[PDB]
Every structure is written in C-alpha cells, then in structure tokens.
Short mmCIF file of C-alpha atoms and ligand atoms in Angstrom, two decimals:
data_model
loop_
_atom_site.label_atom_id
_atom_site.label_comp_id
_atom_site.label_asym_id
_atom_site.label_seq_id
_atom_site.Cartn_x
_atom_site.Cartn_y
_atom_site.Cartn_z
CA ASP I 1 -18.42 0.63 -16.38
CA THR I 2 -14.88 -0.12 -15.12
CA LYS I 3 -13.29 -3.12 -13.45
CA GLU I 4 -12.71 -0.95 -10.32
CA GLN I 5 -16.39 0.10 -10.22
CA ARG I 6 -17.33 -3.62 -10.60
CA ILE I 7 -15.07 -4.53 -7.63
CA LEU I 8 -16.60 -1.77 -5.45
CA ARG I 9 -20.17 -2.76 -6.37
CA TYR I 10 -19.32 -6.41 -5.59
CA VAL I 11 -18.01 -5.46 -2.13
CA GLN I 12 -21.07 -3.32 -1.39
CA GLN I 13 -23.33 -6.29 -2.31
CA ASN I 14 -21.27 -9.18 -0.85
CA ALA I 15 -19.61 -7.83 2.28
CA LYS I 16 -20.93 -6.45 5.63
CA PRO I 17 -20.70 -2.63 6.12
CA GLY I 18 -18.14 -1.77 8.79
CA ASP I 19 -16.50 -5.23 8.58
CA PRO I 20 -13.02 -4.86 6.95
CA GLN I 21 -12.31 -8.63 6.96
CA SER I 22 -15.49 -9.25 4.88
CA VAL I 23 -14.41 -6.46 2.49
CA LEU I 24 -11.01 -8.10 1.93
CA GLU I 25 -12.65 -11.54 1.43
CA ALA I 26 -15.11 -10.10 -1.12
CA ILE I 27 -12.37 -8.40 -3.13
CA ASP I 28 -10.29 -11.64 -3.10
CA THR I 29 -13.32 -13.71 -4.18
CA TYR I 30 -14.14 -11.32 -7.00
CA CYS I 31 -10.56 -11.26 -8.27
CA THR I 32 -10.08 -15.04 -8.15
CA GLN I 33 -13.46 -15.96 -9.68
CA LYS I 34 -14.28 -13.02 -12.03
CA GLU I 35 -11.50 -10.60 -13.03
CA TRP I 36 -7.89 -10.31 -11.89
CA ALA I 37 -6.88 -6.95 -10.42
CA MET I 38 -3.66 -5.45 -9.03
CA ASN I 39 -4.66 -5.60 -5.32
CA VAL I 40 -1.87 -6.86 -3.02
CA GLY I 41 -3.95 -10.05 -2.52
CA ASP I 42 -4.25 -12.50 0.33
CA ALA I 43 -0.84 -14.27 -0.05
CA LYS I 44 1.26 -11.11 0.20
CA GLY I 45 -1.50 -9.57 2.38
CA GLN I 46 -0.84 -12.16 5.15
CA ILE I 47 2.87 -11.10 5.16
CA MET I 48 1.74 -7.41 5.33
CA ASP I 49 -0.49 -8.26 8.33
CA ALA I 50 2.44 -9.93 10.13
CA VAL I 51 4.67 -6.84 9.53
CA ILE I 52 1.93 -4.40 10.70
CA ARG I 53 1.34 -6.45 13.89
CA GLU I 54 5.07 -6.56 14.64
CA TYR I 55 5.63 -2.80 14.35
CA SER I 56 2.17 -1.40 15.38
CA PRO I 57 2.95 1.85 13.42
CA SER I 58 1.24 5.07 14.50
CA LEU I 59 1.67 6.83 11.12
CA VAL I 60 1.78 4.94 7.80
CA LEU I 61 2.29 6.35 4.34
CA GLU I 62 1.09 4.32 1.33
CA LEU I 63 2.18 5.14 -2.20
CA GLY I 64 -0.54 3.94 -4.57
CA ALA I 65 -4.00 3.10 -3.24
CA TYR I 66 -5.68 1.52 -6.31
CA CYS I 67 -9.07 0.26 -4.91
CA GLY I 68 -8.16 0.56 -1.23
CA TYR I 69 -7.44 -3.18 -0.63
CA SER I 70 -4.03 -2.57 1.05
CA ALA I 71 -5.40 0.57 2.86
CA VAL I 72 -8.20 -1.61 4.36
CA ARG I 73 -5.68 -4.38 5.11
CA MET I 74 -3.38 -2.02 7.05
CA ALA I 75 -5.95 0.28 8.59
CA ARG I 76 -7.98 -2.60 10.12
CA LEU I 77 -4.91 -3.57 12.22
CA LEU I 78 -3.84 -0.10 13.33
CA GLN I 79 -4.25 0.84 17.00
CA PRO I 80 -6.97 3.41 18.01
CA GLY I 81 -5.72 6.86 16.99
CA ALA I 82 -3.12 5.54 14.47
CA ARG I 83 -3.37 6.93 10.91
CA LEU I 84 -2.70 6.06 7.30
CA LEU I 85 -2.10 8.56 4.53
CA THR I 86 -2.44 7.11 1.00
CA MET I 87 -1.31 8.90 -2.16
CA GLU I 88 -3.20 8.14 -5.36
CA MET I 89 -2.57 9.92 -8.66
CA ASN I 90 -5.59 8.41 -10.48
CA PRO I 91 -8.77 10.35 -9.49
CA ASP I 92 -11.07 7.48 -10.48
CA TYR I 93 -9.11 5.07 -8.28
CA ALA I 94 -9.00 7.64 -5.44
CA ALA I 95 -12.83 7.81 -5.58
CA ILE I 96 -13.10 3.97 -5.47
CA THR I 97 -10.64 3.83 -2.51
CA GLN I 98 -12.60 6.48 -0.56
CA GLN I 99 -15.87 4.56 -1.07
CA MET I 100 -14.14 1.24 -0.11
CA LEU I 101 -12.83 2.74 3.13
CA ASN I 102 -16.24 4.30 3.85
CA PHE I 103 -17.96 0.92 3.37
CA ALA I 104 -15.33 -0.81 5.58
CA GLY I 105 -15.95 1.83 8.31
CA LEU I 106 -12.25 2.86 8.21
CA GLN I 107 -12.68 6.46 6.91
CA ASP I 108 -11.61 8.08 10.22
CA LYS I 109 -8.21 6.31 10.13
CA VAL I 110 -7.28 6.96 6.49
CA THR I 111 -6.68 10.14 4.46
CA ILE I 112 -6.53 9.91 0.62
CA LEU I 113 -4.13 12.41 -0.94
CA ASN I 114 -4.96 12.96 -4.67
CA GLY I 115 -1.92 13.78 -6.70
CA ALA I 116 1.57 12.73 -7.59
CA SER I 117 3.75 11.35 -4.77
CA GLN I 118 6.71 13.47 -6.02
CA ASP I 119 4.59 16.65 -5.46
CA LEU I 120 2.81 15.49 -2.25
CA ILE I 121 5.80 14.07 -0.31
CA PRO I 122 7.48 17.57 0.03
CA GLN I 123 4.16 18.94 1.46
CA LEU I 124 3.81 16.30 4.23
CA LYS I 125 5.59 18.28 6.96
CA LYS I 126 4.03 21.73 6.44
CA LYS I 127 0.59 20.89 4.98
CA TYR I 128 -0.19 17.51 6.61
CA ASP I 129 1.59 18.16 9.97
CA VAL I 130 3.81 15.07 9.59
CA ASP I 131 7.05 14.82 11.64
CA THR I 132 8.49 11.39 10.63
CA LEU I 133 6.90 8.25 9.19
CA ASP I 134 6.73 4.96 11.11
CA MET I 135 6.15 2.84 8.00
CA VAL I 136 5.85 3.29 4.23
CA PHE I 137 4.08 0.84 1.90
CA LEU I 138 5.30 1.25 -1.72
CA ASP I 139 2.84 0.01 -4.34
CA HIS I 140 2.80 2.68 -7.08
CA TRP I 141 4.81 3.03 -10.32
CA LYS I 142 7.64 0.53 -9.98
CA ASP I 143 10.15 2.99 -11.48
CA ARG I 144 9.17 5.45 -8.68
CA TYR I 145 10.09 3.31 -5.66
CA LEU I 146 13.74 4.42 -5.71
CA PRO I 147 13.25 8.17 -6.51
CA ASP I 148 10.46 8.46 -3.91
CA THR I 149 12.53 6.67 -1.24
CA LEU I 150 15.39 9.16 -1.92
CA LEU I 151 12.83 12.01 -1.79
CA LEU I 152 11.43 10.82 1.56
CA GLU I 153 14.99 10.86 2.97
CA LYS I 154 15.69 14.39 1.52
CA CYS I 155 12.48 15.71 3.10
CA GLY I 156 13.51 14.38 6.57
CA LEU I 157 10.51 12.02 6.68
CA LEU I 158 12.51 8.95 7.63
CA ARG I 159 13.77 8.18 11.12
CA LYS I 160 15.87 5.38 12.62
CA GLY I 161 13.62 2.35 12.37
CA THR I 162 11.18 3.58 9.67
CA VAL I 163 9.92 0.43 7.92
CA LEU I 164 9.71 0.53 4.10
CA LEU I 165 7.61 -2.42 2.80
CA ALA I 166 7.63 -2.73 -0.99
CA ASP I 167 5.25 -4.73 -3.14
CA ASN I 168 6.10 -6.35 -6.49
CA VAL I 169 9.85 -6.47 -6.10
CA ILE I 170 9.93 -9.58 -8.35
CA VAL I 171 6.89 -8.97 -10.63
CA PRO I 172 6.72 -6.48 -12.34
CA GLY I 173 9.96 -5.91 -10.41
CA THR I 174 11.79 -2.89 -8.93
CA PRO I 175 15.44 -3.70 -9.86
CA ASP I 176 16.97 -0.30 -9.11
CA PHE I 177 15.15 0.01 -5.76
CA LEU I 178 16.17 -3.55 -4.70
CA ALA I 179 19.81 -3.07 -5.68
CA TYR I 180 19.94 0.26 -3.89
CA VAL I 181 18.39 -0.72 -0.59
CA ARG I 182 20.24 -4.09 -0.46
CA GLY I 183 23.56 -2.33 -1.10
CA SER I 184 23.06 0.61 1.27
CA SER I 185 24.40 0.73 4.84
CA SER I 186 21.39 3.01 5.55
CA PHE I 187 18.96 0.05 5.17
CA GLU I 188 18.56 -3.33 6.76
CA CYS I 189 16.69 -5.56 4.27
CA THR I 190 14.62 -8.71 4.43
CA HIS I 191 12.99 -10.46 1.46
CA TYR I 192 9.61 -12.22 1.90
CA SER I 193 9.03 -14.59 -1.04
CA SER I 194 5.36 -15.05 -1.98
CA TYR I 195 3.06 -14.96 -4.96
CA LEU I 196 1.62 -12.43 -7.32
CA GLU I 197 -1.94 -11.64 -6.28
CA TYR I 198 -4.43 -14.28 -7.49
CA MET I 199 -1.78 -16.11 -9.54
CA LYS I 200 0.63 -19.03 -9.38
CA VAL I 201 3.52 -16.67 -10.20
CA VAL I 202 6.32 -15.90 -7.74
CA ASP I 203 6.48 -12.38 -6.38
CA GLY I 204 7.65 -10.94 -3.07
CA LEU I 205 7.78 -8.13 -0.57
CA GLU I 206 10.97 -6.38 0.48
CA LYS I 207 11.21 -4.85 3.97
CA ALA I 208 13.94 -2.20 4.19
CA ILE I 209 14.40 -0.68 7.62
CA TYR I 210 15.97 2.80 7.59
CA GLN I 211 19.02 3.12 9.90
CA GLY I 212 19.69 6.88 9.63
CA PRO I 213 22.29 8.83 7.58
O1 77R A 301 1.57 -1.32 -11.73
C1 77R A 301 1.28 -1.74 -10.58
N1 77R A 301 1.05 -0.86 -9.57
C2 77R A 301 1.12 0.60 -9.83
C3 77R A 301 -0.21 1.07 -10.47
C4 77R A 301 -0.08 2.58 -10.93
C5 77R A 301 0.29 3.45 -9.75
C6 77R A 301 0.31 4.94 -10.19
N2 77R A 301 0.47 5.80 -9.01
C7 77R A 301 -0.32 5.80 -7.88
C8 77R A 301 0.12 6.81 -7.07
N3 77R A 301 1.20 7.40 -7.69
C9 77R A 301 1.42 6.79 -8.84
C10 77R A 301 1.14 -3.22 -10.34
C11 77R A 301 1.15 -4.09 -11.42
C12 77R A 301 1.09 -5.45 -11.21
C13 77R A 301 1.13 -6.39 -12.40
C14 77R A 301 1.70 -7.65 -12.26
C15 77R A 301 1.74 -8.51 -13.32
C16 77R A 301 1.23 -8.12 -14.56
F1 77R A 301 1.27 -8.98 -15.58
C17 77R A 301 0.69 -6.86 -14.72
C18 77R A 301 0.62 -5.99 -13.64
C19 77R A 301 0.88 -5.98 -9.89
C20 77R A 301 0.82 -5.11 -8.81
O2 77R A 301 0.70 -5.62 -7.51
C21 77R A 301 1.03 -3.75 -8.99
O3 77R A 301 0.95 -2.89 -7.89
K1 K A 302 -3.93 -2.96 -3.03
MG1 MG A 303 1.22 -4.17 -6.10
#
C-alpha cells in the first residue's frame, strides 16, 4: 500500500466525482493532516491558477505528473477543446494520475505520456501531432529542467510567447535552469515567491517566457 494509493483512495472517498475543486481540496487536506506529498500544493497552486487564467493556453505540456494534482489544477481552468499532455516516467504514478483525472472528470482534456521526457519530447511533432507549445509546466527531476528546456527549443516546440512555469526553483532548487533562463536574452523571467507545498518553507515558481532565437 503506497502513499500515492492512499491519496487516490482518500480523494475517491472524500471528494465529489467530476468536481475538480473538491479533488484538489481533498488532496490538500490529506497532505496537511496525514502525510506530506510532493504535489504543487495550494500556495503555489493559486499562482499557477493566476498564470493559466492570464494566458488561457490551448496546448500545455507538463513534465512530471506525480498524482495528477497539477494536471487537475491546470486542466480544470482550460477552455473547451484545450489540451494538456503530461509526461510521467514512473508507471505507478502514471496509473494514479490517470485514475485522479478520471475521478475529476478531466480525462478528455489530458493525455498521460508514460516514459522519459528526453525520449518523448522528440516524438511530440510526428507522433502526437504537436506544432508548438503554448505553455510548459516543469515539475520533474530538478536536474532535467535545463536539458529539457534546451531539448524543447532544439525540437522547434517553442514559439514566441511560450510560457515556461517551473516549480521548486528554490526547494529542492534548479540552480542551472534559473541561472540560464535569467541570463538569456531568449527568455523574459519573473519570480513568484511562495511556499513549499504543505510547509512553512520558502519556495517559488519561475515564469520564463520564450522570445525566439
Ligand atoms: O523531486 C520532486 N519532483 C520530481 C519527482 C520525480 C520526477 C521524475 N520524472 C517524472 C517525469 N520525468 C521524470 C519534488 C521534490 C520536492 C521536495 C521538496 C522538499 C523535500 F525535502 C523533498 C522533496 C518538492 C516538489 O514539489 C517536487 O516536485
Ligand atoms: K503536482
Ligand atoms: Mg514540485
């Protein structure tokens, strides 16, 4: 019995099917009262919501799904017809995320891609019929934020205005990614100071808007 299975069971028994807000509230209650887990959380989640509402992206890519908390958070605010693709290397987490989206009634808006982001990103154009991405949410291996951002550019997946939103830039931290985007004329950066999910520890989101080559 895993922590991720316990979170999914808790949602199924304490939230309303087809109600994404109740799913988010149940995950946040479980993680504050029972066991911490690496979901983006409500503090950083409110900043995510404000970014999503500002840009109303039609196609979002997420790197790292975990239990589907951030996928539910983003997908619930997407416009009819807009889509989210989420890459998850851990098959057990991918199965939890699929069941979380199904319970939230968001399954038609989100596609889980099982595998490594370094292998899946080069297949987006030809296999998944992607042209360019409107937004990317980075929440996977912290040492992969920079290489995958460089890979997205190489693959022609970024366009002028693509919004990169990165979790955990302070804790655990993404020092090479932060230094790179903040020092590059190809990105316009904004830091949103906040708190590590379910903890009185400072963390933050970085928004890095791609400006073209
Ligand atoms: O490691 C994290 N995420 C990546 C999980 C593996 C992704 C693998 N993958 C998925 C797809 N392709 C590759 C993470 C960790 C923490 C944290 C903070 C404080 C602490 F004391 C311990 C941990 C907080 C988060 O918010 C995080 O996201
Ligand atoms: K999450
Ligand atoms: Mg995170």
